[PDB]
Design a protein around this ligand. Structure first.
Ligand code: SAH
Ligand code: SAH
Ligand code: QP3
Ligand code: QP3
Ligand code: CL
Lengths: 319, 319
């Protein structure tokens, strides 16, 4: 039926995970047709049982069956690349920590202690827990780096970064965004603020160990906050934007860049942000409200089309 | 995109789980429109955060939204009933034990020890592990009971049970099938064989602690094996049917009743059987082959339509 297979939606994620996490998908590069019997003899995977997985991947539209062989669909070519953001996504999506967080989601809706389903499961908030877990941190930081890399060319196209002198990326992670921006926009001061136990090292990048809940460093004319606010509540989001306003002068600009809530696209990510952070994916209207409460003004709004989600580009200045 | 939401299929299962497992769905009985504002005040669930879950349930088609009120869809009325098989399904579907089994599925394809992904995760095969886990056993046995209670009406309609005298349901669990048959077909001897640490109790039902891998007891003219063989390999399936042939005389009949693999329906269940049991969902042809290898003859075959899956009804007698 439609209901029982909807209940069994997890099986689709788990099937893809088995195919990608093992590295079996990396044998399907450049849309080649793979003989499963030969792949079985080479990789030492069970032929009969992997053939049944491939049949389910064909049903999902991940594989295509022709000439008694299988190729990745045009869309699913990314699964052949273990460096792709999709490879890191599935590795996190149904990992034990995420799964155990989802199992506390129901109970978390009845609590008023400000503890996420993740924290209820693991005993710390997401980012504080990642400090002690290499698997979660490395794979998450990798995912953020890959999606940062994808939007760079689009972001440089719609806004002039050359007019600016000193640029700070707040919660910039490994600092991929500014590293790629600096290669095309030379002769600027580049800084990246995040939570570092050991400062990253990159040519002409000033890596800052800071806390955007406490303070943002002043004396930059361009600030960037990309995919941060949907990890935070309304009050924490206002506190962050308030710290920007206190750091910014009249000439300063803040580029608030976020995966934006649009009715056409799935609410699934909005729920994931609730489970992991007690966060939420916000519309343009909700982002504008929080900015106004912090004493910031919207001077420019654009929509950036990415494969996986639409993005809201919001240029903020002090009132 | 379609690919990232296919990767994130697990979020659909986890959302339904949080809605049903908490018992919030039990407030949506008889297709009534629920005020989330009132349900929040009454049950103590977070209004804003549950309203967001409801929006995701509307997207999935589980809920219908009209004038800022939510009702269960005609199809998902079952979620209002905690005794429904769908309620038990989701509670098992993404439970930690199933999730941890799925995480070993990839690695299990490279092993050849006859150990399921579940056994690799938990250290014991499924049913042996259920002996020491009441949560899994009680919910699994409850699920098998609910689906047994659904098919009884159609099964009585297509086969004359009144011709028989002594009836044994092999691997009959809580014995729901025969209890329901015995109410409509009176004056017979009814027996249920399964693995019991303590024998269940029901009026005019002889519960037997047995092992169908070792032996099936002789002296019955009707044998029933319903949804057993897809927990077993081809060799173990043959061993079970061989034990039937040894137990049966020329006058005996075996009813092999199973969810049947048809090309129109999903392969997702076939993969679940591999993960949990190293089992498989078989076609009519594959079932007939195993019976022929065991020394049994097919007298009569029929298809029984159930909401969630088609069933293969196969009447067998000895060669
Ligand atoms: N209190 C805090 N102070 C500074 N950075 C924080 C923080 N809490 C979380 N972060 C960082 O916020 C980031 C959110 S993920 C976004 C990373 C990057 N801006 C990108 O778009 O790809 C993580 O790198 C996390 O380490
Ligand atoms: N070795 C064994 N001997 C007997 N029963 C067994 C067994 N291994 C598993 N079983 C039982 O086989 C059943 C599979 S589930 C099917 C239950 C029932 N026939 C129905 O259709 O609803 C479980 O009740 C399990 O306890
Ligand atoms: C910062 O919080 C996030 C947290 C996130 O998940 C915990 C994500 C993302 C952000 C995210 O940007 C993203 C983009 C594309 C695919 C994804 O799976 C994600 C994503 O999972
Ligand atoms: C005995 O092995 C099973 C094992 C099973 O799962 C472990 C199931 C079933 C059988 C099963 O029959 C079933 C029917 C309808 C919905 C279901 O989720 C199931 C099911 O999960
Ligand atoms: Cl008796």
């Amino acid at each position: 039926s439609m209901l029982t297979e909807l209940i069994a939606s997890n099986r689709r994620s788990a099937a893809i995970h088995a195919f990608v996490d093992t590295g079996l998908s990396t044998h399907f590069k450049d849309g080649i047709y793979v003989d499963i019997s030969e792949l079985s003899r080479k990789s030492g995977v069970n032929y009969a049982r992997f053939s049944r997985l491939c049949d389910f991947l064909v049903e999902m539209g991940v594989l295509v069956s022709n000439d008694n062989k299988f190729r990745l669909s045009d869309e699913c070519h990314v699964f052949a690349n273990p460096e792709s953001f999709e490879s890191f996504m599935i590795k996190l999506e149904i990992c034990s920590h995420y799964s155990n967080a989802w199992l506390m989601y129901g109970k978390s809706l009845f609590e008023d202690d400000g503890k996420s389903a993740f924290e209820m499961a693991h005993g710390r908030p997401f980012f504080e827990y990642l400090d002690g877990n290499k698997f979660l941190k490395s794979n998450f930081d990798a995912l953020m780096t890959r999606v940062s890399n994808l939007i760079v060319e689009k972001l440089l196209g719609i806004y002039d970064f050359n007019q600016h002198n000193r640029i700070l990326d707040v919660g910039g992670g490994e600092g991929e965004l500014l590293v790629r921006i600096s290669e095309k926009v030379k002769g600027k001061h580049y800084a990246v603020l995040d939570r570092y136990s050991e400062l990253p090292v990159s040519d002409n990048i000033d890596f800052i160990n800071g806390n955007f809940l406490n303070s943002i460093p002043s004396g930059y004319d361009l600030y960037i906050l990309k995919n941060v606010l949907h990890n935070w509540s309304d009050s924490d989001s206002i506190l962050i934007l308030e710290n920007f306003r206190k750091a910014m002068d009249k000439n300063s600009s803040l580029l608030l860049i976020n995966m934006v809530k649009e009715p056409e696209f799935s609410r699934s990510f909005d729920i994931l942000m609730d489970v992991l952070f007690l966060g939420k994916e916000r519309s343009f209207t909700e982002f504008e409200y929080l900015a106004n409460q912090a004493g910031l003004v919207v001077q420019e709004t654009k929509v950036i089309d990415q494969s996986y989600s639409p993005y809201s580009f919001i240029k903020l200045q002090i009132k």
